[PDB]
Amino acid sequence: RCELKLIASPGSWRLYSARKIDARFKSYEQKIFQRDRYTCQFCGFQAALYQDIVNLDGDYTNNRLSNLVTACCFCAQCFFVESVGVGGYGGGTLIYLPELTQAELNSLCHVLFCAITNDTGYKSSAQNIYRSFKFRSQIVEEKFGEGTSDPAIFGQLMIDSGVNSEEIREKLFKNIRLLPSRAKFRKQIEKWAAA
């Protein structure tokens, strides 16, 4: 059980995004996938396709294997709040959800989205839950202002305000979760079921 947190930083995503097309990276990328049994080390979701590599210390210049863990895309994007939904990178909404941890929400959303794309009888229940989650974005905007449930906006506000310390970041994100976007992940959700 690795620790999920919401991180907004000026340049981590750029290092992480550039590493992803580096050739030396694709070498050891498969080593991490194999070591972790293609399993997200934050929520437990398993898949052969679309898994990501995140860095435990948040430092994307430190790519020794003991700092790298497999992460699904719902969990990976938590470490790049400011980039979520920017340039086609993932997608999500910040919500006030003290009732679930981020990891619990992410593993549940994998279950909900599969139940919605492949109805066996639980699509309606799954939609009802996801919609109640998404409704909780309004409490975030009542606190921080209109539009700020958009993670790209919220994360840019923190970065441009110079928010540096862990103590301040913890308070701002207290009981806030990044709810992954079923719409933006439709390609992944469907391909995970066929594959």
Partner: protein
């Protein structure tokens, strides 16, 4: 596609609001809330004896559906 030209002034405005929150010493949302569907799925996840998380969510959704009903 290009954002509306009030973008820069809206950003500076939004930042000034965010800034006063930063200075208030009241940084978190501390709200008491209750949604029946969120309560039910959280209660099912909490009371589960299933260890693996994807399987725990699978069983919790089923128990949700049966209890909702």
């Amino acid at each position: 596609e290009p954002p509306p030209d009030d973008y820069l002034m809206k950003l500076q405005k939004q930042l000034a609001s965010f800034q006063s929150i930063l200075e208030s010493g009241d940084l978190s949302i501390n709200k008491a809330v209750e949604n029946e569907e969120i309560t039910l799925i959280s209660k099912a996840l909490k009371e589960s004896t299933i260890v693996e998380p994807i399987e725990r969510g699978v069983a919790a959704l089923i128990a949700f559906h049966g209890q909702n009903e």
